[PDB]
Amino acid sequence: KEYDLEKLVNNSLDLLSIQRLDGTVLQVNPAFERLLGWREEELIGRNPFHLLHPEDRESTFQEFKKLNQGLPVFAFQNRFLCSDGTYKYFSWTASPDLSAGLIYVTGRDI
Amino acid sequence: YDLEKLVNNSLDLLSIQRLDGTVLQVNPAFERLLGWREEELIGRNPFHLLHPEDRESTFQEFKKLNQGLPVFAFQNRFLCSDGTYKYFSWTASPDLSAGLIYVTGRDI
């Protein structure tokens, strides 16, 4: 089963990610490399808020508080730094799992 | 599993089909975007919901999948439960050995 689901997630053009409640990235699909230019290994195991545009920090952290309170987030927009040194806009939809301590993230470039 | 929770909580359409088109698995996003319940899609070919003008192009893509070639950001219209056609962008990866196609979709 886990093989099939892996092929499903990895063949999405949209960003699919699993984070911890504190922000630590556990999983990313190849779409991140395609859209942001960063390799998987450079993102996994670390918090991504350092690629977050300074102006978008306050709003993004407020959304992360909501996730930590067990509220979903729909079509939230912020900017992430890409490997070419430019900021690109993304629309995020995030679903929290408090028992597992995870957040399930879907992202679209805009 | 964790990946299952990712698939089932995703805004994107995620589906597994057979090479002949028969739908084996569908995530809740299909119900959300197309209005159809899982039970009424599983086990069935979805080309019925395919807009007539998009049939020829979609079947050409399915031939490519059957030749083992992936398909990226292919756009067609599917009929929804409210009786309207909605636009989708599909990305499909074939697995000839398993006899499956991994389909990922986004509403346009």
Residue numbers in the entry:
A (entry chain A): 7 to 116
B (entry chain C): 9 to 116
Please give the exact wording used by the authors of the publication that reports this structure.
The long-wavelength beamline I23 at Diamond Light Source overcomes these limitations and extends the accessible wavelength range to λ = 5.9 Å. In this study, we report the determination of diverse protein structures by experimental phasing techniques carried out at long wavelengths on beamline I23 at Diamond Light Source using S, Ca, K, Cl, V, I, Cd, and P as anomalous scatterers. Native-SAD uses light atoms naturally occurring in proteins or bound to proteins. We demonstrate that long-wavelength native-SAD has become a very compelling technique, where a low multiplicity dataset from a single crystal can be sufficient for successful structure determination, making it a general vehicle of choice for experimental phasing.
